[PDB]
């Protein structure tokens, strides 16, 4: 109810931060470098769900 | 640069997995939990000054 939902305050922090490196190292090496990245993420439609 | 971008993508996953999982948690103990997740942290943001 509470003491469950505690715990995961500290781990949106693990992902929060986990994120914030993902992000400088895209916009590191080359922001446009999202455009084509983009596409990947969009090439996953025909995945997850399926054996 | 598609290597940086791929190592990229995998991070992003990963991150992006960890909040899936952790949004998933919350809201399986109870959609409610999200109120006093917002107080507790409302309540960590705020200002001092004396009183």
Not at 1 to 14: A, D, G, H, S, Y
Not at 30 to 51: M, N
């Amino acid at each position: 109810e509470n003491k469950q939902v505690e715990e995961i305050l500290r781990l949106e922090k693990e992902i929060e931060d986990l994120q914030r490196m993902k992000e400088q190292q895209e916009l590191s090496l080359t922001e446009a470098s999202l455009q084509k990245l983009q596409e990947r993420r969009d090439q996953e439609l025909r995945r997850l769900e399926e054996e």
